[PDB]
């Protein structure tokens, strides 16, 4: 987070959660939130998605304690489970601000005490929040930020009407709260909300090829932690009905990685020690969406008819840089920018520099 508008204290708290970086798509959300802009972001459930809004909002508030104070931030989540995770993430990176979590199927007593004592960041489900507005205990007239998290799930559950009622209280045109909308897909209801509640100058973060062509990222990671980071990149960059190829050197690396719990459910391997008939079947299956993650060695990948994919991952810097560039060309479906990730170890640091010289390319070192 060097030259990121985050305090040293916050960076130390993030380290305590094993957060040492934000993926570029998350890093882009940070700047839009930090700059005060209204936003529609496209990302699914993840650790870094919550931090994309939590870190810049917390920094803002820390810069800006009366008993019974009204919240400054409202985060609506569709379930008790999701609300509890968002609240915990805020609470883990701020020891200064009062963080509260309000959901249904629970008594009012504890929630009443939080409101009596004062709240800075309020996380909750629409039903319970609406109830507290109605009973006159919750003040949403002093909000500065509103986050509508997992709008897809929220709408699927039938909350659209209740969310519209809640927003109608906080957005009574000038000096309205900063509005942040998050989802994995962008339904009709998302832009209908933006058209009414959001400023005409609202931003969008979704990976559609906006004069970039192809992203080349570099991740410094010890081999023992690579599988957890690989799952995280797929969750962040690839989506539902997503195509991802992971390239390895050794057949054991590809086999073990495909068998590894991080992606075991969605992954399938392709190496020399697999019969040709099965290698044929498996590639055909990948093409016709039987599974979403193909873990193949760089050897078996030579000459193999690979389709257009969302994300290309390298376990270590590529020795055949020529093949790496060809695969970059065959990345980025449905008008979206292609993501090319290269994992490297401290010992493989110069090995990644060779790729850059040989290809005449610059990796976003994250
Ligand atoms: Mg076919």
Author numbering: 188 to 251, 255 to 362, 365 to 558
Sentences from the paper on this structure:
DDX21 is composed of three domains, including the N‐terminal domain, the middle D1 and D2 domain, and the C‐terminal foldase domain. In summary, here we reported multiple sets of crystal structures of RNA helicase DDX21 either in ligand‐free (DDX21‐apo) or in complex with AMP (DDX21‐AMP), ADP (DDX21‐ADP), or a nonhydrolyzable ATP analog (AMPPNP) and a 15‐nucleotide poly(U) ssRNA (DDX21‐AMPPNP‐U15), corresponding to different unwinding states (except for DDX21‐AMP). We elucidated the conformational rearrangements upon the ATP and ssRNA binding during the dsRNA unwinding cycle, and described an RNA unwinding machinery including one wedge helix, one sensor motif V, and the DEVD box.
Therefore, we deleted the linker loop partially (GKKTQ; residue 401‐405) and generated a new construct (named as a del‐loop mutant), which helped us obtain a 1.8 Å resolution crystal structure of DDX21‐ADP and another DDX21‐apo structure with 3.1 Å resolution. Here, we have shown that the DDX21 helicase core adopted an open conformation in its apo‐state, and the success of crystallization either without the linker loop or del‐loop constructs indicated the vast flexibility of the open conformation in solution. When DDX21 was in the apo‐state, the RNA binding pocket was closed tightly. A short loop (TGTG, named as “TG loop”) within the motif I had severe steric hindrance with the modeled AMPPNP in DDX21 apo‐structure; thus the ATP‐binding pocket was in the closed conformation. From the apo‐ to post‐unwound state, D2 domain not only shifted ≈29 Å but also rotated by ≈180°; from the post‐unwound to post‐hydrolysis state, D2 shifted ≈24 Å and rotated by ≈100°; and from the post‐hydrolysis back to the apo‐state, D2 shifted ≈25 Å and rotated by ≈78°. First, the apo‐D1D2 core bound dsRNA in an ATP independent manner.
